Each structure stands twice: as structure tokens, then as C-alpha cells.
Amino acid sequence: GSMAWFFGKIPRAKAEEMLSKQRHDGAFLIRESESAPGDFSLSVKFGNDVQHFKVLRDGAGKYFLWVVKFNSLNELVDYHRSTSVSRNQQIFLRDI
Predict the structure, then answer these.
(1) 9 and 32 Cβ atoms separated by less than 8 Å
(2) Long-range Cβ pairs for the range 19-24 (8 Å, 24+)
(3) Where does the SH2 domain lie?
């Protein structure tokens, strides 16, 4: 029933001003970006600064801020020693 976080089209500069007054870190708003059709941005008050993040999209039109992909098998395996191979189960890799 209406999202307080959607501020439509507004200049970066207006959200900075409107966020630096929000006291609690993690205060945020999404905003249609002002130069790229359908682009979105997420602005976050954090610390004494106000931060911005491009809202990425994939060829399927999924949205995501950041994802993790590796350059090689070595790195892929190295990562999953501390984070789940699966997503529904927590299975970590341990060398035999």
C-alpha cells in the first residue's frame, strides 16, 4: 500500500540534501535516474555521507546491486570453503 521508498524522478543532489537530515544510517530511497531510460538508483544515508548505487539489470530484466562471479575454478572453489555451495542447504567445501 504505497512504498515510502519510491521517490520517482529527482536530482541526485535533492536526495543527498533530503537524506543527510535523516538521522539513522541505512535511511534510503530509490529514484528513477536522470539520464538513461528506465535507470534506477538507490541512495543511502550512511555515516556522515550519502551514497548512491546503480541498480543493475540482466538481459532477463532481473535487478541486482551486486553479484559474485569468479574468474577461475580456483577462486570459485576457494570462495565456497566459507560460503554455501547450495542455497537451501549449508554445505561448505572441505579438501579430502
Answers:
(1) yes
(2) 19/43, 19/44, 19/45, 19/50, 20/45, 20/48, 20/50
(3) 5-96
Spell out the domains of the chain, with CATH numbers in brackets. 1-96 (3.30.505.10)
Rg (alpha carbons) of the chain, rounded to whole number: 18
- The residue type of 10 is I
CB 68 within 8 A of CB 79: yes
Q: In b/e form, how buried is each residue of 53-70, taking b as 16+ CB within 10 angstroms?
A: eeeeeeeeeeeeeeeeee
Strand 27-32 relative to strand 6-9, pairing: parallel
Q: State the residue for C-alpha cell 541498480.
A: 55
